[PDB]
Amino acid sequence: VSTFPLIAARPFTIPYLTALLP
Amino acid sequence: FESPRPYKLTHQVVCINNINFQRKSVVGFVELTIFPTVANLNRIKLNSKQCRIYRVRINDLEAAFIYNDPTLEVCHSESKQRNLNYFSNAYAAAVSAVDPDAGNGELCIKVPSELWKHVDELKVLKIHINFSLDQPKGGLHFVVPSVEGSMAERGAHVFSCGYQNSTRFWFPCVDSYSELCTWKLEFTVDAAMVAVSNGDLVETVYTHDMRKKTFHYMLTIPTAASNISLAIGPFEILVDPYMHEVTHFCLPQLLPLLKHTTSYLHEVFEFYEEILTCRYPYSCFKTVFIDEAYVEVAAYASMSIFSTNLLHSAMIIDETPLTRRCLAQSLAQQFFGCFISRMSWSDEWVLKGISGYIYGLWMKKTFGVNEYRHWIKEELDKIVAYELKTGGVLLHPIFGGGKEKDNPASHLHFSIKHPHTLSWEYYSMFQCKAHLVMRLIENRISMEFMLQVFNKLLSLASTASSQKFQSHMWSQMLVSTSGFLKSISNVSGKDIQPLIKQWVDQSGVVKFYGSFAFNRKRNVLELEIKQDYTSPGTQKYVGPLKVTVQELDGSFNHTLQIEENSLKHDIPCHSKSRRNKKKKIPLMNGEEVDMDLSAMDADSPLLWIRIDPDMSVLRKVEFEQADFMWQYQLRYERDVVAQQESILALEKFPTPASRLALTDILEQEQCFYRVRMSACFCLAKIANSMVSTWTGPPAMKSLFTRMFCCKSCPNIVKTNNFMSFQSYFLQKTMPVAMALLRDVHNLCPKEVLTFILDLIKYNDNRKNKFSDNYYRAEMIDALANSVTPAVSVNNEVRTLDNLNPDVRLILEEITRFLNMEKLLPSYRHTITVSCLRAIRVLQKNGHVPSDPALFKSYAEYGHFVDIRIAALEAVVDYTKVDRSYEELQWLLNMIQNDPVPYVRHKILNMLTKNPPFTKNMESPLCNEALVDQLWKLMNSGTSHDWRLRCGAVDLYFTLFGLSRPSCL
Numbered sequence: 001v002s003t004f005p006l007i008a009a010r011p012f013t014i015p016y017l018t019a020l021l022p
Numbered sequence: 023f024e025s026p027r028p029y030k031l032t033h034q035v036v037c038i039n040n041i042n043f044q045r046k047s048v049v050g051f052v053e054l055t056i057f058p059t060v061a062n063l064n065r066i067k068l069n070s071k072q073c074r075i076y077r078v079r080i081n082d083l084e085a086a087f088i089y090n091d092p093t094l095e096v097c098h099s100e101s102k103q104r105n106l107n108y109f110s111n112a113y114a115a116a117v118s119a120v121d122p123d124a125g126n127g128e129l130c131i132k133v134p135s136e137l138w139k140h141v142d143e144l145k146v147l148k149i150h151i152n153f154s155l156d157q158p159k160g161g162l163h164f165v166v167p168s169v170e171g172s173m174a175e176r177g178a179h180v181f182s183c184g185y186q187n188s189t190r191f192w193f194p195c196v197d198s199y200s201e202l203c204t205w206k207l208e209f210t211v212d213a214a215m216v217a218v219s220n221g222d223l224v225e226t227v228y229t230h231d232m233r234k235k236t237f238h239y240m241l242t243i244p245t246a247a248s249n250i251s252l253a254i255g256p257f258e259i260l261v262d263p264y265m266h267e268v269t270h271f272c273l274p275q276l277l278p279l280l281k282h283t284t285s286y287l288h289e290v291f292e293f294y295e296e297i298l299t300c301r302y303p304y305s306c307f308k309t310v311f312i313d314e315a316y317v318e319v320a321a322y323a324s325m326s327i328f329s330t331n332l333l334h335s336a337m338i339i340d341e342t343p344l345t346r347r348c349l350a351q352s353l354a355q356q357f358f359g360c361f362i363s364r365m366s367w368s369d370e371w372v373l374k375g376i377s378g379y380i381y382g383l384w385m386k387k388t389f390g391v392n393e394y395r396h397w398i399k400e401e402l403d404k405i406v407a408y409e410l411k412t413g414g415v416l417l418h419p420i421f422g423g424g425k426e427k428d429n430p431a432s433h434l435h436f437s438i439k440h441p442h443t444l445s446w447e448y449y450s451m452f453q454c455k456a457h458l459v460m461r462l463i464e465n466r467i468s469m470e471f472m473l474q475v476f477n478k479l480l481s482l483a484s485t486a487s488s489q490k491f492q493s494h495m496w497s498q499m500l501v502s503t504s505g506f507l508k509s510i511s512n513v514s515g516k517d518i519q520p521l522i523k524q525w526v527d528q529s530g531v532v533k534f535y536g537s538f539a540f541n542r543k544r545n546v547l548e549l550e551i552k553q554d555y556t557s558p559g560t561q562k563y564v565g566p567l568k569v570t571v572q573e574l575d576g577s578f579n580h581t582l583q584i585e586e587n588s589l590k591h592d593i594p595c596h597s598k599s600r601r602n603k604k605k606k607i608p609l610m611n612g613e614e615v616d617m618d619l620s621a622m623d624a625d626s627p628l629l630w631i632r633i634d635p636d637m638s639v640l641r642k643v644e645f646e647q648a649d650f651m652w653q654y655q656l657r658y659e660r661d662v663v664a665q666q667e668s669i670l671a672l673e674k675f676p677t678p679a680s681r682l683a684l685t686d687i688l689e690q691e692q693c694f695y696r697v698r699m700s701a702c703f704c705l706a707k708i709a710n711s712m713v714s715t716w717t718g719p720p721a722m723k724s725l726f727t728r729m730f731c732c733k734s735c736p737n738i739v740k741t742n743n744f745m746s747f748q749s750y751f752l753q754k755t756m757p758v759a760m761a762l763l764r765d766v767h768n769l770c771p772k773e774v775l776t777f778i779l780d781l782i783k784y785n786d787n788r789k790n791k792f793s794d795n796y797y798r799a800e801m802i803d804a805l806a807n808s809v810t811p812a813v814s815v816n817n818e819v820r821t822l823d824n825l826n827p828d829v830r831l832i833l834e835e836i837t838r839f840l841n842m843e844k845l846l847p848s849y850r851h852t853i854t855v856s857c858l859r860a861i862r863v864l865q866k867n868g869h870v871p872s873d874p875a876l877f878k879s880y881a882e883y884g885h886f887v888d889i890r891i892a893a894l895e896a897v898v899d900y901t902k903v904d905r906s907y908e909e910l911q912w913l914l915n916m917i918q919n920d921p922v923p924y925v926r927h928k929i930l931n932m933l934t935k936n937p938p939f940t941k942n943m944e945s946p947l948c949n950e951a952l953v954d955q956l957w958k959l960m961n962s963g964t965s966h967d968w969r970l971r972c973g974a975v976d977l978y979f980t981l982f983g984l985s986r987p988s989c990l
Binding site for chain 1: 167168169173177273275276279313330331333335336337793824830833834837840841844847849850851876879880882883884885886887
């Protein structure tokens with residue numbers, strides 16, 4: 001929790017509308 | 023000439039009704055228009071899978087019904103012969119029997135004696151079949167956002183992905199290729215959800231006036247069954263403005279991206295009819311984008327249906343090739359998935375030949391004739407690498423007919439009559455050899471004659487199309503290998519049947535020991551070099567060709583070759599190039615300007631060896647020159663081919679600092695992009711050879727100095743360094759090779775480390791209009807190429823130092839970018855992908871411990887493909903080196919169980935490229951039960967698609983190929 005607390009994965013419903021959105 | 027297939031066919035009608043999103047099924051009736059060939063044609067066979075028929079009928083007569091699935095397992099489930107060879111042969115014979123290209127049975131409705139006497143009277147019938155696709159478990163796709171309440175209405179789509187003959191898996195037909203028919207197609211659609219298939223919008227108003235709509239697509243143009251596919255749900259954009267009928271379909275909130283994406287298409291159609299001298303031989307062209315692909319390319323009749331990864335919406339520069347690159351394939355194969363058509367699987371190669379070659383011709387006259395040649399070199403890279411991994415990629419006309427084999431290329435599996443035996447490695451290299459054999463047909467025959475041939479092809483085809491069905495006189499659109507060859511020789515009869523029997527019919531790559539000798543080294547013998555070759559395992563002996571040599575400032579000397587290859591040969595000699603302080607430039611190549619006496623120039627009137635710089639013969643050339651000649655070729659040559667091959671040859675051995683000098687000199691001009699990328703990797707290798715010979719500086723910092731002035735750049739280059747795409751790729755590449763620069767004390771790239779961290783600091787605002795994305799990605803990969811294997815001397819894996827020291831800084835940066843792309847996300851989580859590769863390489867040096875649960879949490883369902891695909895590559899190497907049995911079991915269970923095809927494709931592909939459990943090295947004990955489950959997954963659970971069990975065939979190729987697995 002101190003040095004590197006990476007956010008875990010969300011995984012959500014619709015990936016393409018998110019990852020292909022300027 | 024003709025088909026050995028009876029019962030000629032004219033027309034067919036589909037009618038999809040009651041398409042479900044909840045129990046997720048489809049019902050429909052088909053009708054077929056048949057002219058039978060001979061009487062007693064009783065057990066009429068069609069073919070499909072995963073199709074519960076509801077009823078069959080011929081003219082209000084439900085006749086008989088036969089329904090087998092030998093595409094499933096062995097007739098005994100415990101046939102203990104659990105090796106390759108029996109399974110390969112048995113499966114080959116099995117699915118050959120599944121094919122109706124013989125008297126066979128999958129759907130043999132028997133004709134009753136009433137209707138048999140009608141056959142004796144009239145061989146004209148109609149066939150009406152009610153049937154229902156279930157949840158499609160290997161034929162179709164119901165892409166569903168996991169909401170199911172309301173967004174199942176707006177947010178889902180439905181289509182058919184599949185391979186060549188997957189029309190079987192969608193609705194019952196023939197051996198689906200090579201049956202010329204025409205179709206009327208009835209589509210029960212939502213009023214919003216638009217369905218797109220072949221043919222034309224022939225009958226649609228607000229249809230049936232009740233709650234929904236219903237579409238009539240009629241394809242009048244006579245085609246075959248493996249072109250038909252229906253994508254249901256997207257949104258219309260005509261992206262017409264230049265050619266008025268170009269039709270595009272994409273999911274909502276994706277639309278203006280097409281407004282950038284789709285254009286340049288008009289230029290492509292302009293190019294293709296500059297080739298073919300026709301029009302786009304159709305009504306319209308239809309294009310569907312989709313979040314999935316069984317295959318990224320996929321191209322059907324008047325319609326290409328492929329992924330929503332290729333939008334490249336106006337700011338995303340690195341898909342400047344790729345998008346229209348793949349669009350090129352989705353037009354060219356279109357035409358030859360249109361009209362020219364294989365008479366058998368063993369007849370195809372001309373198809374993919376001419377299609378891929380045509381879009382190679384596109385790649386000439388669209389961008390980068392030097393990148394065109396670069397692309398050809400990568401083709402040879404793929405082909406040489408694969409047929410030295412494996413056996414040949416052969417283009418049969420020849421059968422093993424009569425239960426015969428005749429297969430030296432059965433190094434794994436069957437090929438002769440069948441698509442569905444092959445690997446994607448094999449099928450890819452099939453297409454690659456297709457490109458290069460059409461280049462050989464350039465090499466014997468005029469491009470103008472190629473235009474002549476193809477125009478004659480399409481003239482005869484388009485003539486033979488679009489008529490009243492000339493009875494018995496119609497199959498001219500099967501334009502396969504033999505008559506095509508005949509038409510070639512009719513245009514110009516040359517000795518191209520030797521070209522066939524060399525390259526079409528001897529699948530062998532040819533290395534070359536053309537051994538450099540040096541006559542006129544003030545020698546009595548004059549300018550001589552010996553020809554040599556022998557290297558079996560996979561060899562081939564090609565004789566009579568020629569040889570291309572550059573003199574000092576003089577003739578491109580070209581010299582014949584022979585078979586019986588213990589040969590010595592001469593050169594059409596240069597002049598006495600003497601007093602060359604005075605002979606400064608006697609015309610090297612045009613008005614090129616160069617002077618060096620730096621080489622061994624007492625008696626060296628030679629400059630460069632070459633065999634066939636236009637890359638005729640499939641080659642892997644091995645020889646030796648003076649290193650001066652290689653470096654001076656890198657001072658200039660008019661071939662990217664020559665430049666990167668001297669890049670490789672000087673990546674092997676040398677380290678003078680003059681090498682470094684000429685490398686950097688090569689990097690700073692207008693020469694070529696990717697030349698400079700491999701030149702960076704040259705500097706990487708050679709400065710890694712500078713441990714005791716650190717003569718030059720800490721390299722390449724001076725290259726960022728002397729090449730990059732923002733505002734004269736007072737010691738650090740920062741800002742806005744784009745719109746000049748030489749510099750774009752070059753800045754994208756160089757710090758990776760800088761992160762390679764290591765000299766053996768602790769390999770110590772500390773200056774480079776801190777420098778790259780500073781590069782990551784100084785990134786730009788929206789002054790760069792270009793989405794500063796991949797630059798981040800490869801700076802991250804440079805950090806991934808800061809491979810430090812040797813910190814943990816004894817046990818330092820386990821939070822001990824909070825492991826130290828620069829590794830932690832790299833961890834800080836990658837942690838930042840992972841959470842930024844969790845927040846920003848910029849374009850496909852491409853940064854996240856490079857990060858995941860970096861984190862695995864950190865596990866491969868034992869700094870963050872070898873634990874998969876991160877990557878496991880990125881192999882999950884609801885992420886992007888590319889994330890998921892890189893996580894699977896990672897966890898595959900995890901199960902390679904680490905011996906995790908359990909996650910392997912998980913992996914195979916997910917190979918069984920997930921909806922996405924392309925992950926199964928790539929799991930099995932790079933699982934086989936990067937295997938654990940490697941054959942005859944069996945420490946992790948596959949013999950226990952893993953062979954059992956693997957044999958099961960070859961048999962069971964894999965009738966979804968062909969290529970999944972083709973990959974399982976590849977698994978048993980690699981893991982314990984040609985034998986018992988040492989179980990019993």
